[PDB]
Amino acid sequence: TVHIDLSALNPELVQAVQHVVIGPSSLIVHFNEVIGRGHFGCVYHGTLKKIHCAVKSLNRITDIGEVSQFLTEGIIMKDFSHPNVLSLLGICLRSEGSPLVVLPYMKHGDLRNFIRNETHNPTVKDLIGFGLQVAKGMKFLASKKFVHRDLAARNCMLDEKFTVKVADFGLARDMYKLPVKWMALESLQTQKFTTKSDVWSFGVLLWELMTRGAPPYPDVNTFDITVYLLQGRRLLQPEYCPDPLYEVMLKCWHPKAEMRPSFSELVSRISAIFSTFIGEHYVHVNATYVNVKE
Ligand SMILES: Cn1cc(-c2ccc3nnc(Sc4ccc5ncccc5c4)n3n2)cn1
Ligand SMILES: [Cl-]
Predict the structure, then answer these.
(1) 54 CB less than 6 Å from ligand 1?
(2) How many domains does the chain have?
C-alpha cells in the first residue's frame, strides 16, 4: 500500500535512462493474453510499424533506491546487444512504480520445449547449429565479463528465423532450487560462479540438445550430485551425438576449471564440427527419457 513519488528520482539518472525508456503511447500491453509466467511477474504479448514484443510486468517497486537500481540495470542490459543474446527493447515505469520490461517476442519459445516437440524433425546439423548459436551468445556475454550462472536449454529462446537467443539474464532473470545438475563441481562446493562454470553448464546444454531435451542424470537425487560426480562420472554420450561433439562436452566438464575451453574456442571447434553435416541425420527420441520429469 506504500505510495511512491517517482519525481523524487535523480535528474542525471532519469536523463541517462531516456534511450531505454518507452513512451506510454509507444507501447500497447495486451494484459488479456498471457504468454509466460515467472516468479517475479507475468509476461504478456505487447505491440511496440507495429512489432510483436514480450512485456514482463514486475512487482510494484516502492523504494526509490530500488527504482534507481532497476534503471541502472536497464542501461547495462540495453548494451548487451548481440544476434545470439535476448536484446532489451526498453523499460517502462507506470504511476506508483509498476515496472514493465519489454523484450523481443520469441515465436518458437524456449529452446528446451522446442526440441522436445515431437512434431519437430531436427537433424544432427540443426541441433549442433543451435549449440553453436548459444556458444556465440556466450562468447559475447563472456567478453562483457558477465557470468550467466543459469545457462540451460530452458533459458535460451528461439525466434522466427530459428535464431537462438541466450536469455534469462539482467531484468529478464527468473525461474520460468539452484540448478545443481547444470553446475560445475567447484560451484557445487564453493557456491562460486565464473565463465568457466558457465562452460560446464554449456556442456550440459549441448547434452540437452543432442537428447532433444532429456533431463540430465534422470535417476540421480539432486541433493547428492556432487557425490555422484566425484565417483568418477559424467553424462553418457547421446545416441545421436557425434564423437567429436561428445569430446567437446567432456572438455567442458574438465575437473580443472582453467583447463576448460573458452567460449571463443567452443565457437571455433563447434563451427568446424557443424560444417561437416548436411542435414541427413535425423535425431530421434530415446525411449528411456520419454515422460521423465526434470
Ligand atoms: C519455459 N519457458 C522459459 C521461458 C523464458 C526463458 C528465458 C527468458 N528470458 N526472458 C524471458 S521472458 C520472455 C521473453 C520472450 C518471450 N517470447 C515469447 C513468449 C514468451 C516470452 C517470454 N524468458 N522466458 C518462458 N517459458
Ligand atoms: Cl545432419
Answers:
(1) yes
(2) 2
Closest CA to 19 of 76, 66, 67, 75: 75
Q: How far apart are CA 270 and CA 133, in angstroms?
A: 10
The verdict on residue 248 lying in a domain is yes
Q: Of 90, 105, 120, at which residue does a domain stop?
A: 105
Query: What are 102's three cell numbers?
Result: 519489454
* 196 annotated ligand-binding residue: no
Q: How was this structure determined?
A: X-ray
Tell whether residue 40 is among the known ligand binding residues.
yes
* Cβ of 171 less than 6 Å from ligand 1: no
- Closest residue to atom 13 of ligand 1, CA basis: 54
Cα torsion at 116, 120, 125, 130 (round to 10°)?
Answer: -50
| Residues 290 and 256 occupy one common structural domain | yes
Cβ-contact 60, 96 below 8 angstroms: yes
- Compute the distance from residue 121 Cα to the ligand 2 centre, in Å: 11
Nearest Cα residue to 149 out of 124, 118, 175, 130: 175
Residue keyed to cell 503511447: 25
Q: Whose CA is nearest to atom 18 of ligand 1?
A: 106
Resolution in A: 1.8
Which domain does 57 fall in, by range? 12-105
For ligand 1, atom 8: residue with the closest CA: 168
Q: What residues act catalytically?
A: 150
Please report, for the domain that includes residue 16, its CATH number: 3.30.200.20
